[PDB]
Amino acid sequence: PTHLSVDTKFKTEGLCVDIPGIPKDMTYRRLISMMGFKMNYQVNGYPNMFITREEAIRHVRAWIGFDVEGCHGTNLPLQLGFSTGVNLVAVPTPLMYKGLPWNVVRIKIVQMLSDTLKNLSDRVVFVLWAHGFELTSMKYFVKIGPERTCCLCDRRATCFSTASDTYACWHHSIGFDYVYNPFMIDVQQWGFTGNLQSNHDLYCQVHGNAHVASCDAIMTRCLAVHECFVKRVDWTIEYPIIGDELKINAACRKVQHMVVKAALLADKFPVLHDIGNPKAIKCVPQADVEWKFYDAQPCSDKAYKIEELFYDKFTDGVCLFWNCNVDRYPANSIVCRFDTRVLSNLNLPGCDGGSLYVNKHAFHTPAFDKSAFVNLKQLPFFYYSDSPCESHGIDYVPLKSATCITRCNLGGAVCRHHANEYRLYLDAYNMMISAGFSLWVYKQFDTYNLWNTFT
Ligand SMILES: Cc1ccsc1C(=O)O
Ligand SMILES: Cc1ccsc1C(=O)O
Ligand SMILES: [Zn+2]
Ligand SMILES: [Zn+2]
Ligand SMILES: [Zn+2]
């Protein structure tokens, strides 16, 4: 129960149009052999090219939808489509490229996967909705063997060069022509009734079938993301650090304490309705306010209807919606909403305009909808501190800022402690906003109300 067994049966019904006469009884072992690969009982870390649905989830940062549409079978040319939007045409002699022989097409393939995956994964997983031509064309750009390391580093090998006879990871594969030891998963194996467009369109309106190979590769990875993260949710799976994860989360916790602390001092609300995560703590532990919690897990499909969340006196005080994505927020709210459109290593394309935000855990977030914040306004940057002006020791330059709400800045000149803490909070703030998060507050929020908290 560790890897997908080669002796597992492979349903070949979806392959019998490109491959007429294919035996109904087939195993992964006979399929791989039929594809043109000799897996000579190698106990060297590569037991099967194909992988389980569970292993594919653990390696979602590696998912690349792959589809091959035979333009005219080694007699006819092939359109090679990928979920990166790329379409390469191979000749046997929405970026649509002209016909070229396999020996140049394979070099282009290694460049695209290396540039796409170098910052997200140690491997590639080809997400397939197999009809025959994609598995048979793999021998033209893929080499398999024992697990290896890069010739320039310690990472596992993902590419191979016939010119130099050496192996490399995604970072050092410049000039490499083969894809070494890739992984793959056929979505049609998961038990679907109907074609890719019928099944995909049941959940996604954002990807259209333009009848190009890349459009199918995109609908495939989309349907695979839906089945594993939108409808099935497993927040037990941990994901490795691949970027600023630790700083982004520490920033979110610092921002949350600051934003909520200031809203309670500015408008002195008597009750705070904490709507969201059931494992949440008071972000402002010393706060005078009556803190009441309401459990709601992160919605991965559609955004929560604010009516189905409330139907008890939510109009009294303020409502804290920290990463709790509702359809239209009440006027009396403090909100942090992840913006799914953000470009980052943590954010992977999602289903129906949503995104798969992978930071320790995979959170498929619904599409960012600007109309959710009609009764709110964008919360502006501000740094508030009521702590004493005590240094306790980096080199200084006098800080001048209107948004340093401190006793020292009220007094006229900001102390070194609040200047250091202001720039540290500005860095945590900018870190969080760039990671894709967006802050919104009730229209009455005015930081001018915080100057009177030191009197
Ligand atoms: C406010 C309240 C009280 C009992 S269930 C509920 C809800 O919001 O679902
Ligand atoms: C392991 C891991 C990955 C992202 S956050 C994190 C942690 O230790 O908090
Ligand atoms: Zn390397
Ligand atoms: Zn889609
Ligand atoms: Zn000060």
What DSSP string runs through 301-346?
A: SSPBPHHHHH---TTSSEEEEES--BSS--SSEEEEEE-TT--SSS
Instruction: Give the C-alpha distances (Å, rounded to integers) separating 162 from 123, 145, 157, 178, 303.
Output: 20, 14, 14, 8, 50
> Amino acid identity, residue 401?
S
Q: Ligand 1: does its nearest atom lie under 6 Å from the Cβ of 313?
A: no
State how far the Cα of 60 lies from the Cα of 123, in Å rounded to an integer: 10
CB atoms within 10 A of CB 211: 9
Please calculate the CA angle 376-378-382 and round it to the nearest 5 degrees. 125
Phi-psi region at 2: left, alpha or beta (left = phi > 0; alpha = psi -120 to 50):
alpha
227 part of the active site: no
Write 152-160 long-range contacts (CB < 8 A, 24+): 155/122, 156/122, 156/123, 157/181, 158/113, 158/114, 158/117, 158/122, 158/123, 158/124, 158/182, 159/110, 159/114
Residue in this structure with the two tokens 């052999």, named with its chain if needed? 33
State how far the Cα of 406 lies from the Cα of 416, in Å rounded to an integer: 12
> Amino acid identity, residue 20?
P
Q: Which residues contact 366 (CB under 8 A, 6 or more apart)?
A: 299, 300, 301, 302, 303, 325, 340, 352, 353, 354
Residue 101 near residue 112 (C-beta atoms within 8 A): no
What six digits make up the tokens of 227?
């089945």
State how far the Cα of 342 lies from the Cα of 338, in Å rounded to an integer: 9
Is there a binding annotation on residue 67?
A: yes
186: nearest Cα among 151, 226, 221, 237: 221
Q: Of all helices (H) and strands (E), which one includes residue 260? A: helix 245-267
Q: Give the CA diameter of the chain.
A: 87
Please give the resolution of this entry in Å, rounded to 1 decimal: 2.3
Whose alpha carbon is nearest atom 3 of ligand 1?
312
What six digits make up the tokens of 294?
């309401």
CA of 408 to the centre of ligand 5 (A): 4
Task: State the angle between helix axes of 416-434 and 245-267 in degrees (0 to 180), rounded to the nearest 10.
Answer: 110
Instruction: Give the C-alpha distances (Å, rounded to integers) separating 366 from 326, 339, 353.
Output: 10, 9, 7
State how far the Cα of 178 lies from the Cα of 190, in Å rounded to an integer: 29
Give the SS3 label for residue 356: strand
